[PDB]
Amino acid sequence: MGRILFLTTFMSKGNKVVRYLESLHHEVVICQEKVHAQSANLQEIDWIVSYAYGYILDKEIVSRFRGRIINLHPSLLPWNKGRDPVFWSVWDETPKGVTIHLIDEHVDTGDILVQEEIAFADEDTLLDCYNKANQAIEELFIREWENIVHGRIAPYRQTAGGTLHFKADRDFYKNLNMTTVRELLALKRLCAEPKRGEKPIDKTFHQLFEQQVEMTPDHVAVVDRGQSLTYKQLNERANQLAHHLRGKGVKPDDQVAIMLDKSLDMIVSILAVMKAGGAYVPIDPDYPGERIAYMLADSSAAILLTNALHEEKANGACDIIDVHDPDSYSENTNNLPHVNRPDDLVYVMYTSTGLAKGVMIEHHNLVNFCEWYRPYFGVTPADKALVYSSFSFDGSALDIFTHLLAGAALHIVPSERKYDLDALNDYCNQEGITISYLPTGAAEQFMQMDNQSFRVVITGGDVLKKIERNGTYKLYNGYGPTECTIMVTMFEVDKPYANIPIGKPIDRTRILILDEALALQPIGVAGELFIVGEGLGRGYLNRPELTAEKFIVHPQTGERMYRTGDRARFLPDGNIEFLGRLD
């Protein structure tokens, strides 16, 4: 009857389409390469039928064969134009279907000849969907071919809108071929970009603290043994010191070293550094003089807040401000004029494998964690919390900062009860301590101690393994590197597990389980744990190349992500599971 040119790159040469056309006594020329006008494949051709053809016909050809180029596209056009239509139909959750349409000078925008809806089951693999779609459109072609040949079908223009996808758009999703529709949409819900409407964080910590002071000014802020400071008292004293600090020339992004033991002065010093404008660099006096010297050297801290006791441990490294000298405190008790942005540094903490690296954290990083922490754990002014961790560690940021914005009362943990957890347990039972964070080691011990005061306890760092505890308090296992601010995931331990999961991401953060090629892994499949979102800090101080290494720009996505180097995977219920180091 007529000679037909069948164009395709993916489909076979024995399609139901080809054989059906051949059954009608058509000479079907099959071609799987890009052709030009001179091509012998275009000699005496009546109809061109394209089907998953991965090339564009020259406009010379499309005009010459106008109204005679038919294309089988397994999507409900205008939805999912271009490449991988079925995959993107499932992923973007668009209407499903198959479309036989005309070819124009653009990608899958030509007028429709025939079109019908298709349906994918929640249990179908994407390969099944791909096959079902091809099956459907092939049958449709065989059904409507006679109507198309005689040209009795009225072509109707596509609806406005739809979507388009290019060849490379599926690179990030190359491992999801055998995943189910359900599994795929689940992975989407877990790892897809944040929904619209969100705005950038617009507050610093000392802004929110100063706000909290005006709401609960006479409430106890911090307690050390028999002495205590209210929010108003703490604020005023921190202000007095902060005025003196800013007077010494402290400015945004400037580092200010603090070398003190756990005390009221430490809290005053920290808040004073913030309110002054700079970021505080905590230095444990019990560190070796070597690390202390290095920490002071690496950091650009021109100022050091410390005692006369620990004064000499710095060896005249910097201008010292004595927290016990009344001259170090100004008369002015008012809140200083704000000069900070949320992207200014708030603190620099060090993590020792090599020489210790100064992790840079910004205000918005800390604000996000605190703003998540308060409602998540339902913290109120009624609560009381321990300042347990060394203030050189990020666990102290949890202790001090999260509870101060909740209006709660901090309780300093002295040295005499740092190791004796039975004595600390007595303190907690006496003072009615309700919530706190203990490292995994210490937390596992506190389960042995008989406690009645606690309402919640939070653990993180090393691998949790024990769960059984005497008290009647909720147990929470968290996870996250210092580079991504304290913690990025949190789990409520309800049952015992051989591997206690580290939970789901906190506010404004996403965790992505990627393979070596930085492509998505299906739910339940192991891979490297990548962190994304508000938690990511500025990077390592004075280590730009190492920062570039660990804080990456994803090849496909282009988002800023932190490479943890940890091994993990998502459980079916969304909870993340830690699976040791990569090496």
UniProtKB/Swiss-Prot annotation:
Residues 3-145 are annotated as: GART. It comes from the Bacteria. Transmembrane segments: none annotated. Large multienzyme complex composed of 4 subunits; LgrA, LgrB, LgrC and LgrD. Activates valine (or leucine, but much less frequently), and then glycine and catalyzes the formation of the peptide bond in the first step of peptide synthesis. This enzyme may also play a role in N-formylation of the first amino acid residue in the synthesized dipeptide. Belongs to the ATP-dependent AMP-binding enzyme family. Linear gramicidin is a pentadecapeptide antibiotic produced during sporulation. Two module-bearing peptide synthase with a C-terminal epimerization domain, which is probably inactive. Each module incorporates one amino acid into the peptide product and can be further subdivided into domains responsible for substrate adenylation, thiolation, condensation (not for the initiation module), and epimerization (optional). At the N-terminus, contains a N-formyltransferase domain that is probably responsible for the formylation of the first incorporated amino acid. This is Linear gramicidin synthase subunit A. The chain holds residues 2 to 584 of 2273 of the full protein.
